[PDB]
Design an enzyme around this catalytic site. Structure first.
Site, mmCIF file in Angstrom:
data_model
loop_
_atom_site.group_PDB
_atom_site.id
_atom_site.type_symbol
_atom_site.label_atom_id
_atom_site.label_comp_id
_atom_site.label_asym_id
_atom_site.label_seq_id
_atom_site.Cartn_x
_atom_site.Cartn_y
_atom_site.Cartn_z
ATOM 1 N N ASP B 70 -2.269 -10.076 -16.253
ATOM 2 C CA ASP B 70 -2.300 -8.697 -15.847
ATOM 3 C C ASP B 70 -3.165 -7.824 -16.704
ATOM 4 O O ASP B 70 -3.855 -7.107 -16.362
ATOM 5 C CB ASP B 70 -1.330 -8.012 -15.756
ATOM 6 C CG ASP B 70 -0.531 -8.286 -14.310
ATOM 7 O OD1 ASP B 70 -0.196 -9.477 -13.896
ATOM 8 O OD2 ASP B 70 -0.515 -7.091 -13.453
ATOM 9 N N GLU B 195 8.177 3.479 -11.409
ATOM 10 C CA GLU B 195 7.051 2.895 -11.666
ATOM 11 C C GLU B 195 5.838 3.130 -10.434
ATOM 12 O O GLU B 195 6.117 3.557 -9.345
ATOM 13 C CB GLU B 195 7.189 1.389 -11.768
ATOM 14 C CG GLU B 195 7.538 0.993 -13.299
ATOM 15 C CD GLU B 195 7.541 -0.467 -13.633
ATOM 16 O OE1 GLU B 195 6.881 -1.297 -13.089
ATOM 17 O OE2 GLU B 195 8.105 -0.861 -14.594
ATOM 18 N N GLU B 196 4.384 2.861 -10.738
ATOM 19 C CA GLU B 196 3.528 2.905 -9.600
ATOM 20 C C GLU B 196 3.567 3.845 -8.552
ATOM 21 O O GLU B 196 3.436 3.516 -7.447
ATOM 22 C CB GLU B 196 3.360 1.488 -9.001
ATOM 23 C CG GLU B 196 2.649 0.418 -9.954
ATOM 24 C CD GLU B 196 2.964 -1.009 -9.480
ATOM 25 O OE1 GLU B 196 3.692 -1.460 -8.697
ATOM 26 O OE2 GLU B 196 2.497 -1.989 -10.025
ATOM 27 N N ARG B 211 7.943 3.497 -7.302
ATOM 28 C CA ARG B 211 8.433 1.875 -7.405
ATOM 29 C C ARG B 211 9.790 1.640 -8.436
ATOM 30 O O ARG B 211 9.573 2.247 -9.542
ATOM 31 C CB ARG B 211 7.422 0.679 -7.391
ATOM 32 C CG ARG B 211 7.973 -0.576 -7.401
ATOM 33 C CD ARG B 211 7.392 -1.332 -8.522
ATOM 34 N NE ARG B 211 6.558 -2.422 -8.575
ATOM 35 C CZ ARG B 211 6.450 -3.401 -9.077
ATOM 36 N NH1 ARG B 211 7.327 -3.930 -9.495
ATOM 37 N NH2 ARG B 211 5.343 -4.171 -9.000
ATOM 38 N N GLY B 264 17.905 -5.321 -6.288
ATOM 39 C CA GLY B 264 17.614 -4.097 -6.929
ATOM 40 C C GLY B 264 16.453 -3.857 -7.889
ATOM 41 O O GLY B 264 15.664 -2.952 -8.145
ATOM 42 N N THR B 265 16.361 -4.938 -8.378
ATOM 43 C CA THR B 265 15.314 -5.119 -9.504
ATOM 44 C C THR B 265 13.934 -5.317 -8.963
ATOM 45 O O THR B 265 13.476 -4.666 -7.710
ATOM 46 C CB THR B 265 15.344 -6.475 -10.614
ATOM 47 O OG1 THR B 265 15.764 -7.432 -9.862
ATOM 48 C CG2 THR B 265 16.587 -5.812 -11.581
ATOM 49 N N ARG B 290 5.610 -11.547 -0.619
ATOM 50 C CA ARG B 290 4.948 -10.557 -0.381
ATOM 51 C C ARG B 290 3.805 -10.778 0.656
ATOM 52 O O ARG B 290 2.739 -10.820 0.596
ATOM 53 C CB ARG B 290 4.270 -10.046 -1.581
ATOM 54 C CG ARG B 290 4.001 -8.556 -2.260
ATOM 55 C CD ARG B 290 4.507 -8.414 -3.838
ATOM 56 N NE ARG B 290 3.415 -8.763 -4.716
ATOM 57 C CZ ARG B 290 3.282 -8.291 -6.010
ATOM 58 N NH1 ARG B 290 4.243 -7.559 -6.432
ATOM 59 N NH2 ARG B 290 2.147 -8.631 -6.546
ATOM 60 N N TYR B 325 -0.182 -5.426 -2.938
ATOM 61 C CA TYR B 325 0.100 -3.792 -3.049
ATOM 62 C C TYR B 325 -0.264 -3.256 -1.844
ATOM 63 O O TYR B 325 -0.894 -3.549 -0.944
ATOM 64 C CB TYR B 325 -0.726 -3.675 -4.331
ATOM 65 C CG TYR B 325 0.012 -3.597 -5.571
ATOM 66 C CD1 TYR B 325 1.145 -4.684 -5.954
ATOM 67 C CD2 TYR B 325 -0.151 -2.910 -6.663
ATOM 68 C CE1 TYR B 325 1.605 -4.926 -6.925
ATOM 69 C CE2 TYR B 325 0.360 -2.943 -7.942
ATOM 70 C CZ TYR B 325 1.358 -4.014 -8.026
ATOM 71 O OH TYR B 325 2.064 -4.246 -9.352
HETATM 72 C C1 LIG Z 1 -1.212 -4.309 -15.647
HETATM 73 C C2 LIG Z 1 0.283 -4.222 -15.142
HETATM 74 O O1 LIG Z 1 1.009 -4.324 -15.846
HETATM 75 N N1 LIG Z 1 0.776 -3.620 -14.097
HETATM 76 C C3 LIG Z 1 1.179 -4.506 -13.121
HETATM 77 C C4 LIG Z 1 0.413 -4.812 -11.967
HETATM 78 C C5 LIG Z 1 0.785 -5.930 -11.219
HETATM 79 C C6 LIG Z 1 2.001 -6.517 -11.349
HETATM 80 C C7 LIG Z 1 2.611 -7.307 -10.465
HETATM 81 O O2 LIG Z 1 3.456 -6.988 -9.886
HETATM 82 O O3 LIG Z 1 1.862 -8.548 -10.566
HETATM 83 C C8 LIG Z 1 2.781 -6.115 -12.602
HETATM 84 C C9 LIG Z 1 2.346 -5.237 -13.335
HETATM 85 N N2 LIG Z 1 3.037 -4.823 -14.598
HETATM 86 CA CA LIG Z 2 13.367 -2.942 -6.911
#
Ligand SMILES: CC(=O)Nc1ccc(C(=O)O)cc1N
Ligand SMILES: [Ca+2]
Ligand SMILES: *[C@@H]1O[C@H](CO)[C@@H](O[C@@H]2O[C@H](CO)[C@@H](O[C@@H]3O[C@H](CO[C@H]4O[C@H](CO)[C@@H](O)[C@H](O)[C@@H]4O)[C@@H](O)[C@H](O[C@H]4O[C@H](CO)[C@@H](O)[C@H](O)[C@@H]4O[C@@H]4O[C@H](CO)[C@@H](O)[C@H](O)[C@@H]4O)[C@@H]3O)[C@H](O)[C@H]2NC(C)=O)[C@H](O)[C@H]1NC(C)=O
Ligand SMILES: *[C@@H]1O[C@H](CO)[C@@H](O[C@@H]2O[C@H](CO)[C@@H](O[C@@H]3O[C@H](CO[C@H]4O[C@H](CO)[C@@H](O)[C@H](O)[C@@H]4O)[C@@H](O)[C@H](O[C@H]4O[C@H](CO)[C@@H](O)[C@H](O)[C@@H]4O[C@@H]4O[C@H](CO)[C@@H](O)[C@H](O)[C@@H]4O)[C@@H]3O)[C@H](O)[C@H]2NC(C)=O)[C@H](O)[C@H]1NC(C)=O
Ligand SMILES: *[C@@H]1O[C@H](CO)[C@@H](O[C@@H]2O[C@H](CO)[C@@H](O[C@@H]3O[C@H](CO[C@H]4O[C@H](CO)[C@@H](O)[C@H](O)[C@@H]4O)[C@@H](O)[C@H](O[C@H]4O[C@H](CO)[C@@H](O)[C@H](O)[C@@H]4O[C@@H]4O[C@H](CO)[C@@H](O)[C@H](O)[C@@H]4O)[C@@H]3O)[C@H](O)[C@H]2NC(C)=O)[C@H](O)[C@H]1NC(C)=O
Ligand SMILES: *[C@@H]1O[C@H](CO)[C@@H](O[C@@H]2O[C@H](CO)[C@@H](O[C@@H]3O[C@H](CO[C@H]4O[C@H](CO)[C@@H](O)[C@H](O)[C@@H]4O)[C@@H](O)[C@H](O[C@H]4O[C@H](CO)[C@@H](O)[C@H](O)[C@@H]4O[C@@H]4O[C@H](CO)[C@@H](O)[C@H](O)[C@@H]4O)[C@@H]3O)[C@H](O)[C@H]2NC(C)=O)[C@H](O)[C@H]1NC(C)=O
Ligand SMILES: *[C@@H]1O[C@H](CO)[C@@H](O[C@@H]2O[C@H](CO)[C@@H](O)[C@H](O)[C@H]2NC(C)=O)[C@H](O)[C@H]1NC(C)=O
Ligand SMILES: *[C@@H]1O[C@H](CO)[C@@H](O[C@@H]2O[C@H](CO)[C@@H](O)[C@H](O)[C@H]2NC(C)=O)[C@H](O)[C@H]1NC(C)=O
Ligand SMILES: *[C@@H]1O[C@H](CO)[C@@H](O[C@@H]2O[C@H](CO)[C@@H](O)[C@H](O)[C@H]2NC(C)=O)[C@H](O)[C@H]1NC(C)=O
Ligand SMILES: *[C@@H]1O[C@H](CO)[C@@H](O[C@@H]2O[C@H](CO)[C@@H](O)[C@H](O)[C@H]2NC(C)=O)[C@H](O)[C@H]1NC(C)=O
Ligand SMILES: *[C@@H]1O[C@H](CO)[C@@H](O[C@H]2O[C@H](CO)[C@@H](O)[C@H](O)[C@H]2NC(C)=O)[C@H](O)[C@H]1NC(C)=O
Ligand SMILES: CC(=O)Nc1ccc(C(=O)O)cc1N
Ligand SMILES: CC(=O)Nc1ccc(C(=O)O)cc1N
Ligand SMILES: CC(=O)Nc1ccc(C(=O)O)cc1N
Ligand SMILES: [Ca+2]
Ligand SMILES: [Ca+2]
Ligand SMILES: [Ca+2]
Lengths: 388, 388, 388, 388
Positions: B70, B195-196, B211, B264-265, B290, B325
């Site tokens: 990543d 997150e996100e 998230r 849940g994670t 996914r 995503y």
């Molecule tokens: C760059 C970054 O750390 N953001 C992310 C993007 C995708 C994923 C993923 O779900 O593969 C995870 C993370 N942490």
């Molecule tokens: Ca989760």
């Protein structure tokens, strides 16, 4: 429009935040990408462009062999928006193995230099038209900044040098309005040798931190009065010291006045700038090769004749990676005007010899007055993946 | 100009009509196409652009090996008009392995984050200039939306998180005017992990569906008051439930208040949005991988603490195909303002291993208030045709 | 702006002068060029664009195999300026295996149709935003013009057909203002079957010359009253006759009223237009295959129920070369409004089988009122030079 | 806007400074680059474009075989900004194996000629629309300038020739307003043969220096009165003499009146222009082949009937390198109007036969009134590196 007069305070700064990077060398491993070197970046009043000298060729191209050589009839000034790399759809803006561009705040100026090394010629292109030219005064490689010029009120300034690199040479300062040379001044003050200047608008005049190939590893200074055309020149006070090769900061020196005779010849293009009494500066991490890059502030580096007190350091490229040239660019904000910089990361030959070509990529950072972390952003190309 | 204040009703909607698709992966099989992931799309007041994080490389490129990772120094924010794919002529808009863009209705904002994972730094680029930056507050991977921010009256909003993914972490909400941070607020309300986020302009404030990596497969909610900078956070009421992995809709739960501890994670970026009392939402067709994508409306999904009543379903990608995503974008019409979304379709490694690289493509649908049929629009690349 | 109302005389014309050609197929033999078919060209009030349905792929691409098939999830509407061919830097403007575009004189309209063949859906994209959609009324391949629509005063018109190709089917006419469907009318008059219309602004209404797959080799006519939404339909009077396959002009017929049952099924997209009493028309040179193209005027071809009197012929592509589809476009001059046309030149499979793909190129001519010579401008690609 | 009336003095000049060069042939050795020939460059009132006739193909393309041939259905007029080379993203502006463009100071004019050699046709495209056309009057290869036309007050001028190259032929002068032919005049004065003119705005009329294929190695002159449409024609006075092949400047002659019968047939496109009484001119360095290029001034070359007094020489390409065609372009400065020129550097077959294709590149210089040095800027492509 009005013209760019740059009358705002310098922004106070804490360091430098990342800005851009183009990944040019990685891309050429499966891409149609120009062979270049000596980059810079400069900005019109709404956006920034990247510039470089092409080698009349792309990297996956039998023609890319032996492109160590600096001067041939096929080098040309490339120009793109900052961030789109030099692909085949890129405009060659002029003929040139040495150059410098800026934007007065109505149009673009490009000073481009090709020709025989003993009788080169520099064309002055402004707003499309070729408005002027000059020939080689000393009959020995006529050369210029390899970075941004600067214009206040519709008068621009470039500084150029004809003569010997490793000896006395002949340095003048041109004042040029809409592409017409309207004044030439010769170097004064104390600077023994003044190649490859990095200039910038310290309002009512311009200031350059330049390169000494002959007697100095401390860097020169070249003050330009925009109003009556006076010039002054010195060296940077700091004993930390800006060139490569150099001596090492136990055994380093400068008095702000004279060259230092400390591995005092060759050099590299590099930059600096005052802040009140202080100096922000970058340089290679290596005293010997053109490897790594680091910035920091020297307390007193501007004012006092050998200061070796450094705070706010930053490693922009790590020790174990190559860099090369470097220079400054200035962009005006809403209230103050800011100072930014780029570094050329050069790959392939001389040094790396698995391949036969020579190109670079770039990374660019801008001055921040806020917080920042830590990292290192090298070219990143596995030479084994590379053609030739 | 004036600024974007987004004061129009949400358009009533019946479902989603196709809008765009770029065929990026098929094209790379005989084309010079960027390796990316985490896309989004956002729109200036006249047109829409697609954005993605490049891997400093193209797909037919020995450098494309091992791009599962990543975070590296060569990821960069790409930007094109919606529909032209990321070729070599594409502008890298900043340095970044995590990002978010929006347009206040005069210029573009980009928040870009590179650096060491323990001391990253985020630059704030607005209208060309680098206007601000911040460092990593918790010294553990500083990260942001990976989708559109939103601006009302010249104040924009991004939400960012430093800390642990699978544990308590540190989430704040930034208010930023012309590229300057003018306020930071910390998370309040009940959300265990945020997150996100996928945010959007429910007029006088902003709403995000985010998230949870730690304790939840129900999705978080993050309400932002634009006027005094208050924050609230909860989970979506619906017992249908938005994350992957998840539990299955016989054995699924949410109370709108607390995480649900039901596989849940981990998680994935996804989206949702209220309509009066109801909820439109999409998600993978698989509870485990996914894979696939589906949208539907839950009756009561907004208001009532476990509603599993779904109408208006749609299969955007079939069960037997990969996705990843996903997020939302909003575009203002003549009378109301509409809500649209994109989904990242990711190919190659980890999962598919015939090849050594990792990239995606995209498909985008917009809310319609009219009639529509049935279909399924996957990436469509035969992995056997592919390089490596 | 005001809107396009097209109230000028048709320009009197003598024939057709060359205008454009893109050499798309030759270029793919060493180039990165899109696989397409069903082109058209249409013009905003200042310039003209070319459009085509891509096959989600480029020609030197294992994915290009089997692209005979008309409908898949990866077809997309391409758009470039007239003359720049579909390279990788081309914008995919929507999702679609059937389409039609026009410009009301403020923005662009695109009607795009993907989906399942039994329940497709057509999105209406105007000025960026998705403004409307419709589903499949007859549950059998919903389809449209594959050429330019036309707009008078801010009301545009497309005609679409759901149902059987070789049988009775269900044809309506949509009236749409800023991307919103504001009226639907069904076909009236005498036309047994009305696929693939070529429409144009015979001021106060619109006229289309369409394609009959069932009972006719004479071509249909579809008159549209812009003011109250009435429709009329007939066949072209001329016994010269426009479709392929057809009967041959000794043994050919039309009465302007009914289909002709003369090799009366299949067909091809083609065009025509009245001039007072007369008819300008083009067609393949072959009665059997889609080979060659020729234009001429029929004296009386408009008014009298079987006229076979032809003057002003022209061979646009010779007998010994392939063509395919074809249609009309109208561009307003300073005083009158002119009528122009394009022809799709299709290469590869079914017919040519040395290779496994199917694409086309184009050539375009415009009406002249001056002098002209003689020639023939085919695709020009040596199939032996071609990949696969 | 107003129209271009070009009423400014010619700029006094000292010689020519470099301006541009595109490196087209080197680039094709690892690049997707158009096969062309007969270039020119012309400028709208703000920037300059380069133009060329493509061969419907790129260089690394089995289709590039045998492109010596001048006329086929696939030649097309290319147009880019000056300096960006002809890649795949280049717009083909019309169908043409012979052409000429200019900009009246509101829109662009292109005169394009395809067809059968015995009955070609020339289309007149102005501001997008095809506004006019003409057929072949002498039924033997209708042909035009292959360089810039010129427009004063909204009347443009092209000169064209139908007939025999090596014999008497039929030369007229067209006056055309907004794409409409508004007057045709035939050649008068003394010029035995007038192919490939290089024209320019000597204010109240236009002047061309043209090419004689039949009886002359001195170059023709073609004066055009813009006001009543009169024509005059002669030959250049200078005994230095402009064509290839030619006789050598010991044994060379011209009387300004009649052809010279001195290797008097074939020829090449070339240029010249008066300065008071004097003449600036360029030509190949070789009297025999199309090799090298040189400029100089002849004292008296304009006025006196055989002057062989040359000053200010310049070697633009060295003896040991290939050139070809060449022509002039004029760009208006703030006070005077300047004269510039380009030269086509052609590579491959006939001459070089290691390869099977034929293309060129270019170099362009503009008139300076300042200083200049010395050099030579050839194509620069190692034919051994080249495909085929
Ligand atoms: C760059 C970054 O750390 N953001 C992310 C993007 C995708 C994923 C993923 O779900 O593969 C995870 C993370 N942490
Ligand atoms: Ca989760
Ligand atoms: C914002 O961000 C940073 C994020 O990193 C914040 O702090 C970070 O702190 C750690 C502290 O150690 C620092 O890492 C150290 O520095 C060196 C980095 O890599 C080098 O590697 C090569 C060498 O040429 C070059 O490419 C490159 O340019 C660097 O020189 C490490 O060398 C170093 O490791 C050694 O020393 C540490 C203690 O510092 C020990 O833990 C190890 O044992 C190791 O060496 C061993 O033991 C002894 C002593 O060193 C010897 O026998 C021998 O060395 C042996 O092998 C070290 O881990 C991060 O990079 C820090 N970054 C910065 C930017 O400070 C940062 O503070 C924060 N700040 C701001 C101000 O923005
Ligand atoms: C707008 O458009 C659609 C256009 O399709 C309109 O209606 C369509 O109706 C048909 C009705 O059957 C529907 O097809 C069905 O759904 C499944 C689609 O493909 C699957 O395949 C894989 C499986 O993982 C995935 O990729 C994908 O995501 C899907 O799950 C088919 O599985 C299904 O076939 C079986 O069941 C049918 C009856 O439904 C039987 O005809 C067959 O026998 C077959 O299975 C067999 O017999 C029994 C029972 O099934 C068992 O022994 C075993 O299953 C055996 O093999 C089925 O044909 C279209 O896709 C519909 N589409 C939608 C979108 O509804 C639609 O109504 C219209 N509507 C709106 C609301 O827009
Ligand atoms: C503007 O431009 C044109 C420029 O060409 C002006 O006039 C030109 O006149 C000539 C007159 O002959 C014409 O060429 C003729 O037409 C055919 C063209 O090529 C064909 O080839 C294949 C066949 O399928 C296809 O690809 C293509 O579509 C065409 O069908 C030639 O076939 C023909 O040659 C035969 O007939 C001529 C007399 O017409 C004889 O000279 C030969 O002997 C030859 O055949 C032989 O003898 C007899 C009789 O034909 C038989 O035993 C057998 O055929 C045998 O082999 C012919 O030369 C140009 O193309 C004309 N063009 C046009 C456009 O008219 C034109 O008038 C001017 N006009 C305007 C109105 O713009
Ligand atoms: C601005 O810039 C220039 C920069 O060069 C300023 O002056 C320069 O002066 C030198 C003076 O010699 C001149 O070089 C000469 O010209 C020829 C250049 O290359 C040729 O090579 C091939 C031949 O076909 C072609 O590609 C090309 O077109 C040229 O023809 C050289 O041939 C020449 O070398 C010979 O003569 C010199 C004296 O001139 C002797 O030094 C050598 O011995 C050599 O030949 C030998 O000895 C004798 C006599 O020549 C014989 O037995 C036989 O020839 C033997 O081998 C020479 O060195 C630069 O190019 C000049 N340039 C210009 C542009 O003038 C310039 O003045 C300045 N000016 C302005 C006005 O801008
Ligand atoms: C330097 O540059 C700006 C460019 O116009 C000048 O702008 C003026 O400055 C203030 C407010 O900006 C007033 O003096 C004028 O009414 C301003 N005009 C605009 C358009 O900003 C500034 O004064 C110039 N300064 C010098 C020292 O020449
Ligand atoms: C929100 O945005 C629009 C952007 O200008 C505002 O526009 C005004 O709204 C109406 C009609 O649009 C009137 O109040 C003004 O005369 C309008 N100006 C224009 C240019 O549209 C709107 O009022 C703003 N609303 C809030 C709540 O701030
Ligand atoms: C159709 O279109 C043009 C577009 O404006 C109309 O233009 C007017 O027509 C004349 C001269 O063009 C006058 O009626 C107006 O003052 C013109 N305005 C402009 C900007 O041209 C034309 O009248 C419209 N006709 C119909 C029948 O609606
Ligand atoms: C030729 O061209 C220019 C284009 O406008 C004319 O411009 C005028 O010339 C002066 C100053 O330029 C005055 O005559 C007018 O007020 C100017 N207008 C502008 C916009 O420049 C010029 O006069 C024209 N000359 C001829 C001989 O027609
Ligand atoms: C740049 O331009 C402005 C021109 O006025 C100069 O500004 C000062 O200029 C005059 C001094 O002779 C005053 O009359 C102006 O009020 C003042 N201008 C403004 C706009 O503040 C300035 O001196 C020039 N600078 C240089 C370096 O030449
Ligand atoms: C073209 C030119 O002579 N300028 C230069 C650029 C780089 C270098 C270099 O340090 O490699 C040297 C010079 N002289
Ligand atoms: C996509 C679609 O179904 N439209 C078509 C296009 C071309 C043809 C064709 O004539 O090959 C047929 C159809 N039906
Ligand atoms: C196309 C065309 O016929 N014009 C020409 C161009 C170049 C040449 C040439 O000199 O090779 C000759 C001609 N006749
Ligand atoms: Ca030195
Ligand atoms: Ca039929
Ligand atoms: Ca001759």
């Amino acid at each position: 429009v009005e013209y760019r007069n740059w009358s705002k305070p310098q922004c106070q700064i804490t360091g430098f935040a990342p800005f851009s990077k183009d990944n040019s060398i990685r891309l050429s491993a499966g891409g149609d990408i120009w062979v270049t070197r000596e980059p810079y970046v400069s900005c019109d009043p709404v956006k920034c462009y990247q510039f470089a000298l092409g080698q009349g060729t792309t990297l996956d191209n039998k023609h890319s062999n032996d492109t160590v050589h600096d001067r041939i009839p096929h080098r040309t000034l490339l120009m793109n928006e900052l961030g789109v790399p030099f692909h085949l759809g890129t405009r060659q803006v002029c003929i040139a193995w040495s150059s410098s561009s800026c934007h007065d705040g109505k149009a673009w100026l490009h000073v481009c230099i090709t020709g025989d090394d003993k009788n080169a010629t520099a064309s002055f292109i402004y707003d499309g038209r070729l408005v002027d030219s000059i020939g080689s005064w000393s009959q020995n490689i006529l050369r210029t900044q390899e970075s941004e010029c600067v214009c206040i009120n519709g008068t621009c300034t470039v500084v150029m040098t004809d003569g010997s690199a490793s000896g006395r040479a002949d340095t003048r300062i041109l004042f040029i309005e809409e592409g017409k040379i309207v004044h030439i001044s010769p170097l004064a003050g104390s600077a023994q040798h003044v190649e490859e200047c990095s200039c910038y608008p310290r309002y009512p005049g311009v200031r350059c931190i330049c390169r000494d190939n002959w007697k100095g590893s401390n860097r020169p200074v070249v003050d330009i009065n925009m109003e009556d055309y006076s010039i002054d020149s010195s060296y940077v006070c700091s004993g930390l010291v800006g060139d490569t090769p150099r001596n090492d900061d136990r055994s380093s020196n400068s008095n702000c006045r004279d060259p230092n005779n400390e591995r005092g010849t060759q050099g590299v293009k590099g930059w600096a700038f005052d802040n009140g009494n202080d100096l922000w500066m970058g340089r290679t991490i290596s005293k010997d090769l053109r490897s790594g890059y680091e910035t920091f502030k020297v307390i007193g580096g501007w004012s006092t004749p050998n200061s070796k007190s450094q705070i706010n350091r930053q490693v922009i490229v790590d020790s174990d990676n190559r860099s090369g040239y470097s220079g400054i660019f200035s962009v005006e904000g809403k209230s103050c005007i800011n100072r930014c910089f780029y570094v050329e990361l050069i790959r392939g030959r001389k040094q790396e010899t698995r391949v036969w070509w020579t190109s670079n990529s770039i990374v660019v950072f801008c001055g921040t007055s806020g917080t920042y972390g830590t990292g290192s952003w090298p070219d990143g190309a596995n030479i084994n993946f590379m053609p030739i």
